[PDB]
Design a protein around this ligand. Structure first.
Ligand code: SRO
Length: 145
């Protein structure tokens, strides 16, 4: 039960400085970022221990928000990619691949929702509403973003 907060508190100071880029889903390369994104993808329960994207953790959640045959396709593609990289880089390649796909748009909603559900900031059945968007913005503002 390590949280996304636990992971950010742990960042090394070259990245702590760039927290707001990170939390904007902006892509930063490196083995620093490789380890942090493994930490967060595990905290949000999106990847296996070795960093492989879990299809079944994302498929239904993505489709509930945006019903789209493309989630299947993008999940299969991005899981395929992450398997072919080393385990240090795997979760981060999965994450990066998804954000670049047409699934990115909905992935960020699912990611935001899970982050705040796990933080106990919104109820477990919370949907992606205008209120939620404001809750996320205020949450980031408290972190200086
Ligand atoms: N609310 C999304 C925050 C967020 C998006 N991508 C991230 C990557 C790492 C992290 O600690 C946080 C994030």
């Amino acid at each position: 039960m390590e949280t996304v907060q636990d992971c950010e508190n742990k960042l090394p100071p070259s990245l702590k400085s760039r927290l707001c880029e990170i939390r904007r889903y902006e892509i930063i390369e490196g083995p620093e970022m490789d380890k942090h994104i493994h930490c967060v993808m595990r905290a949000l329960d999106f990847v296996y221990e070795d960093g492989r994207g879990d299809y079944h953790k994302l498929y239904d959640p993505l489709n509930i928000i945006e019903l789209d045959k493309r989630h299947d396709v993008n999940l299969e593609k991005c899981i395929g990619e992450c398997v072919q990289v080393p385990t240090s880089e795997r979760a981060h390649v999965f994450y990066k691949c998804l954000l670049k796909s047409t699934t990115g748009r909905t992935f960020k909603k699912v990611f935001d929702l899970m982050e705040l559900k796990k933080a106990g900031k919104v109820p477990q059945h919370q949907r992606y509403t205008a209120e939620f968007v404001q809750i996320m913005k205020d949450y980031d503002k408290a972190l200086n973003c």
